Design an enzyme around this catalytic site. Structure first.
Site, PDB file in Angstrom:
ATOM      1  N   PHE B 345     198.326  65.622 129.650  1.00 46.21           N
ATOM      2  CA  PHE B 345     199.457  64.502 129.215  1.00 46.21           C
ATOM      3  C   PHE B 345     200.605  64.894 129.928  1.00 46.21           C
ATOM      4  O   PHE B 345     201.776  64.336 129.650  1.00 46.21           O
ATOM      5  CB  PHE B 345     199.676  64.450 127.779  1.00 46.21           C
ATOM      6  N   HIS B 364     204.656  69.361 117.887  1.00 46.92           N
ATOM      7  CA  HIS B 364     205.137  70.461 117.408  1.00 46.92           C
ATOM      8  C   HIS B 364     204.337  71.536 117.973  1.00 46.92           C
ATOM      9  O   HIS B 364     204.564  72.584 117.613  1.00 46.92           O
ATOM     10  CB  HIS B 364     204.762  70.111 115.804  1.00 46.92           C
TER      11      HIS B 364
HETATM   12  N1  SAH Z   1     197.729  69.737 128.761  1.00 52.72           N
HETATM   13  C1  SAH Z   1     197.235  68.946 128.129  1.00 52.72           C
HETATM   14  N2  SAH Z   1     196.681  67.757 128.293  1.00 52.72           N
HETATM   15  C2  SAH Z   1     196.004  66.894 127.191  1.00 52.72           C
HETATM   16  N3  SAH Z   1     195.550  67.241 125.969  1.00 52.72           N
HETATM   17  C3  SAH Z   1     195.985  68.394 125.721  1.00 52.72           C
HETATM   18  C4  SAH Z   1     196.888  69.371 126.713  1.00 52.72           C
HETATM   19  N4  SAH Z   1     197.355  70.339 125.888  1.00 52.72           N
HETATM   20  C5  SAH Z   1     196.767  70.529 124.796  1.00 52.72           C
HETATM   21  N5  SAH Z   1     195.837  69.298 124.548  1.00 52.72           N
HETATM   22  C6  SAH Z   1     195.402  68.901 123.330  1.00 52.72           C
HETATM   23  O1  SAH Z   1     196.202  68.544 122.390  1.00 52.72           O
HETATM   24  C7  SAH Z   1     195.632  68.489 121.003  1.00 52.72           C
HETATM   25  C8  SAH Z   1     196.540  68.881 119.979  1.00 52.72           C
HETATM   26  S1  SAH Z   1     195.915  69.090 118.282  1.00 52.72           S
HETATM   27  C9  SAH Z   1     196.109  67.443 118.245  1.00 52.72           C
HETATM   28  C10 SAH Z   1     194.640  66.534 118.144  1.00 52.72           C
HETATM   29  C11 SAH Z   1     194.832  65.226 117.788  1.00 52.72           C
HETATM   30  N6  SAH Z   1     196.002  64.615 117.979  1.00 52.72           N
HETATM   31  C12 SAH Z   1     194.667  64.994 116.022  1.00 52.72           C
HETATM   32  O2  SAH Z   1     195.618  65.068 115.232  1.00 52.72           O
HETATM   33  O3  SAH Z   1     193.429  65.243 115.709  1.00 52.72           O
HETATM   34  C13 SAH Z   1     194.511  69.387 121.261  1.00 52.72           C
HETATM   35  O4  SAH Z   1     193.427  68.746 120.812  1.00 52.72           O
HETATM   36  C14 SAH Z   1     194.550  69.937 122.618  1.00 52.72           C
HETATM   37  O5  SAH Z   1     193.229  70.021 123.163  1.00 52.72           O
HETATM   38  C1  EMO Z   2     195.997  79.433 116.780  1.00 52.91           C
HETATM   39  C2  EMO Z   2     196.434  77.746 116.630  1.00 52.91           C
HETATM   40  C3  EMO Z   2     196.683  77.140 117.682  1.00 52.91           C
HETATM   41  C4  EMO Z   2     196.886  75.825 117.753  1.00 52.91           C
HETATM   42  O1  EMO Z   2     197.434  75.518 118.951  1.00 52.91           O
HETATM   43  C5  EMO Z   2     197.110  75.296 116.473  1.00 52.91           C
HETATM   44  C6  EMO Z   2     196.639  75.879 115.349  1.00 52.91           C
HETATM   45  C7  EMO Z   2     196.468  77.248 115.507  1.00 52.91           C
HETATM   46  C8  EMO Z   2     196.583  75.022 113.999  1.00 52.91           C
HETATM   47  O2  EMO Z   2     196.344  75.632 112.812  1.00 52.91           O
HETATM   48  C9  EMO Z   2     197.358  73.878 113.920  1.00 52.91           C
HETATM   49  C10 EMO Z   2     197.279  72.873 113.026  1.00 52.91           C
HETATM   50  C11 EMO Z   2     197.524  71.575 112.716  1.00 52.91           C
HETATM   51  O3  EMO Z   2     197.587  70.815 111.381  1.00 52.91           O
HETATM   52  C12 EMO Z   2     197.601  70.941 113.867  1.00 52.91           C
HETATM   53  C13 EMO Z   2     197.914  71.580 115.132  1.00 52.91           C
HETATM   54  O4  EMO Z   2     198.250  70.859 116.048  1.00 52.91           O
HETATM   55  C14 EMO Z   2     197.513  73.181 115.085  1.00 52.91           C
HETATM   56  C15 EMO Z   2     197.492  73.845 116.412  1.00 52.91           C
HETATM   57  O5  EMO Z   2     198.018  73.346 117.424  1.00 52.91           O
END
Ligand code: SAH
Ligand code: EMO
Ligand code: SAH
Ligand code: EMO
EC number: 2.1.1.283
Lengths: 474, 473, 37
Positions: B345, B364
């Site tokens: 992204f 966040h």
């Molecule tokens: N450079 C990048 N491009 C695309 N996705 C990325 C990224 N760096 C991190 N992410 C993705 O960002 C997500 C943050 S956690 C959020 C997961 C999803 N929005 C939910 O709420 O279920 C992770 O799944 C990670 O794989």
């Molecule tokens: C070691 C570690 C790395 C992460 O990037 C996350 C977390 C832990 C994590 O606990 C987490 C909880 C959550 O509710 C949302 C997140 O995006 C997260 C996180 O992104």
């Protein structure tokens, strides 16, 4: 996972515990007003809740726990517990940079930028650490990024023994906890109860009981990462100590531990000074085996003027007691030789024979059962027929009660649940560091009968830590 | 330190707080009974509480927190907080060894046989589970004999939720342990760089951890690859299986993908109902940084007119297709309602003019510089009728925020304890990736640097809220 | 015919209607005294 309907019984106990909470409130404010009345007129006021106030806090804490269990959404509550270690870090960080002391120096509050300058923490990060604590009732927010002490954090102002205890829980104990899962499942570490094969030795990467690692003299350039997986005391990066006459530095953890047991002894061990009839002994000799710096002799000396003490622990701990702790908290007691110190290893025969009371507080829980019966056999061999051995430890109850301990009212957990949270936290600290064990009455009996001692009484006090009073089977 | 007399205000607020708890209990049982009647007739019942019930849980938790603060001995309470991390560990240990799943397989179970099926020694495992039982997780029904209780039951056959505990109890813990030292070191302390955090200090690496999870390591090196991070504890007894190229993926990759499903269904379920998705017609939401797409899963059940594209990194998009969506909605893959895109992204959004760009738990994870670039690449592809919804904690404080509703006095305006999870995660983001959970005003400035305006904040049945963003046009 | 356990709803309504009975008693007493005058 779907949400389940609540049952009739859930509703009925939620009402029952709410009515308990409401009765405890009326008891608590009544006893706040009697406490106030004891404070103005002036003793025990300044150290201990009254019996009535302590029973209401304990009851009301137990009810709190069960109300949370009953009203919470289960998955929400699982993930709140799962992450609640971060509040431990926040308190540790705050206390390690003496934020209570800094805020007490003003109290209309302090801007966080000026708080930041005196702590070394970056101001916007330090804002999030303090608002974590504020939401959870430690410290106050009084303006936009302006903070102050509250009624809870105030007890940390000019309280080095209590700050030392916080520091001990957040330093070695934390990394030991982190490695405790991997220690429990490894088939070699998993079953042993050896003092030398704990999560803690794995964290430090050493082969020595943890008591002597804290007593090392390290070279100045080796000390900060001397802890291997343990990061060390956080403030050392910013407050290095100048080498002493040998070119070496002490480990900060030695003196932290010495004062921590003073601090901890005054929170949970204060009851034993007043809920045991010490005055009825007259002019008696108490030998504080493993007495540390002598924090418990400090508490007893101020109140029963006729007792004579000798504090027994390791050389270096004794010397800290003699050179900095007792000079600065009770110099008349030493100048009169009312309190004596003795370097001693409690795996050997105690040099003092026939003393009235042998006090042993928070020592048996640092060792698994084999060491423990050796330490009690050491004393026993030296007791007179009128001698009394008092063990001051958590005598663990369970959520379903014990024949020899008084249970909480129904519908509460028999051990008062949340009221015992500290005892369980220390149970896992003992497993991670020393393989020790917090023990139930039945487990204490088994090691006392193996040592040729008999348990004459359990003393339930205004503390979740109790006294086990033992004599020899004679 | 001596004990202090309590003030009139302590007593008056202890009363006011106690009366609030007592009113909340009467509301809670009233709404449990409306819940019972609605569960029977049969929707939303099975995923989340009623509005009136949610406000009662939130208010009573706020009152619980303030009651502890007013009745506790200060020092007792200081040392209880200081050591309460061991309860996080105990739960981690129990949850790692699938103790919920094990006890649901049976009157309770003897702890000796619990020891056999976990690998933890029985005398010690008694003490982990009576810790939990004393604190309302699991129950003891006999002499060292244990069973699930009303709280631990929610982990049986709940791999998304169990993964979340495992995530908070593995990497995050070691990052947390080294987070004091990282905050005070004069070089790491001021930094907001994703690569100079307590986590990097733990792993002994420089790479952002989104890519460390994705490394392919060989079995003899893997268990201590985390350096100061001990690694998933189960590896000692449950070695990882090599793939077709002879390398093993690291456990944390599969855990994190599933964890955000679990986490999304706990605090992100509200957003599926307290925003008018049905009113969009047949719409296309783009789940940018969507992970496995756990939230497309939550929405797909309820609004059959919506279409989706999940944007994330190769391996999670990969795990989504080969183990997650096969077993969670195979029909959505046959109907092309969901299409997937391996995408960073930090590049221009490949799908232009979509109805919704969903961005949850993505802002966040980064300090302000990274966020302004991801927010602009989303908007560089938005039409004027496009809507960006970010699902994150909109952080309030104990003294309230103009754009958020405050709790009754004497309670903390942010409902105090009710927000304990947001603060725990605030420090996880600080510890692992130098992220930040943000106040409304801190969200506003990073949106105006990306050329977006904050149209509305959506307060929902969750501590997590929705920010709806427009184009500055 | 066996006795059945009571439900959560039975308990909650028995509370709610008892609380209604109790509010009605206070009104009835107030209006008995207005009526008498
Ligand atoms: N450079 C990048 N491009 C695309 N996705 C990325 C990224 N760096 C991190 N992410 C993705 O960002 C997500 C943050 S956690 C959020 C997961 C999803 N929005 C939910 O709420 O279920 C992770 O799944 C990670 O794989
Ligand atoms: C070691 C570690 C790395 C992460 O990037 C996350 C977390 C832990 C994590 O606990 C987490 C909880 C959550 O509710 C949302 C997140 O995006 C997260 C996180 O992104
Ligand atoms: N081999 C040994 N011989 C004597 N004392 C020992 C010992 N190993 C550890 N100790 C002491 O055992 C004590 C455990 S902590 C208890 C301190 C004291 N009883 C108090 O409650 O304040 C520490 O002070 C430590 O110095
Ligand atoms: C790492 C570590 C090692 C220990 O030996 C102790 C502790 C921590 C500890 O926290 C502790 C607390 C306490 O109240 C009494 C103790 O004897 C202790 C300890 O003995």
């Amino acid at each position: 996972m779907e949400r389940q309907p609540k049952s009739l019984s859930d509703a009925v106990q939620l009402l029952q515990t709410t009515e308990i909470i409401s009765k405890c409130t009326q008891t608590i404010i009544a006893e706040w007003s009697n406490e106030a009345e004891t404070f103005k007129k002036r003793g025990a006021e300044l150290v201990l809740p009254s019996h009535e106030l302590f029973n209401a806090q304990r009851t009301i804490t137990a009810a709190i726990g069960k109300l949370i269990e009953l009203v919470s959404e289960p998955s929400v509550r699982i993930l709140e517990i799962a992450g609640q270690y971060q509040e431990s870090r926040a308190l540790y960080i705050a206390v390690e940079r003496r934020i209570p002391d800094i805020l007490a120096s003003q109290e209309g509050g302090m801007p966080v930028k000026e708080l930041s300058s005196r702590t070394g923490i970056e101001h916007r990060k330090l804002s999030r650490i303090l608002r974590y604590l504020c939401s959870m009732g430690t410290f106050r927010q009084v303006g936009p990024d302006v903070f102050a002490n509250n009624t809870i954090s105030a007890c940390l102002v000019a309280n080095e023994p209590l700050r030392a205890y916080v520091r001990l829980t957040g330093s070695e104990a934390f990394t030991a906890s982190d490695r405790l899962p991997k220690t429990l499942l490894d088939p070699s570490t998993g079953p042993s109860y050896d003092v030398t094969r704990t999560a803690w030795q794995d964290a430090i990467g050493t082969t020595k009981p943890r008591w002597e690692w804290i007593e090392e003299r390290v070279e100045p350039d080796k000390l900060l990462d001397s802890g291997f997986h343990y990061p060390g005391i956080p403030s050392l990066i910013l407050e290095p100590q100048a080498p002493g006459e040998d070119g070496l530095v002490a480990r900060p953890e030695l003196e932290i531990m010495g004062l921590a047991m003073v601090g901890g002894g005054r929170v949970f061990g204060a009851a034993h000074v007043f809920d045991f009839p010490w005055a009825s002994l007259g002019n008696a000799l108490v030998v504080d085996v493993g007495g540390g710096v002598g924090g418990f002799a400090l508490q007893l000396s101020k109140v029963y003027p006729d007792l004579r003490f000798v504090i027994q622990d390791r050389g270096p701990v004794i010397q800290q007691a003699l050179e900095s702790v007792w000079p600065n908290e009770n110099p008349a007691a030493l100048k009169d030789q009312r309190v004596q110190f003795m370097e001693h290893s409690f795996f050997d025969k105690n040099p003092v024979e026939g003393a009235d009371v042998y006090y042993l507080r928070y020592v048996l829980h640092d060792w698994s059962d084999d060491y423990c019966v050796n330490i009690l056999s050491r004393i026993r061999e030296s007791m007179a027929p009128h001698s009394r051995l008092l063990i001051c430890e958590q005598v663990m109850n369970t959520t379903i009660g014990d024949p020899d301990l008084t249970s909480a009212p129904a519908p509460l957990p028999a051990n008062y649940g949340f009221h015992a949270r500290f005892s369980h936290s220390r149970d896992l600290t003992m497993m991670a560091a020393i393989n020790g064990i917090e023990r139930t009455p039945e487990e204490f009996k088994t090691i006392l009968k193996s040592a040729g001692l008999a348990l004459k009484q359990i003393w339930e006090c205004r503390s979740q830590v109790s006294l086990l009073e033992a004599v020899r089977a004679d």
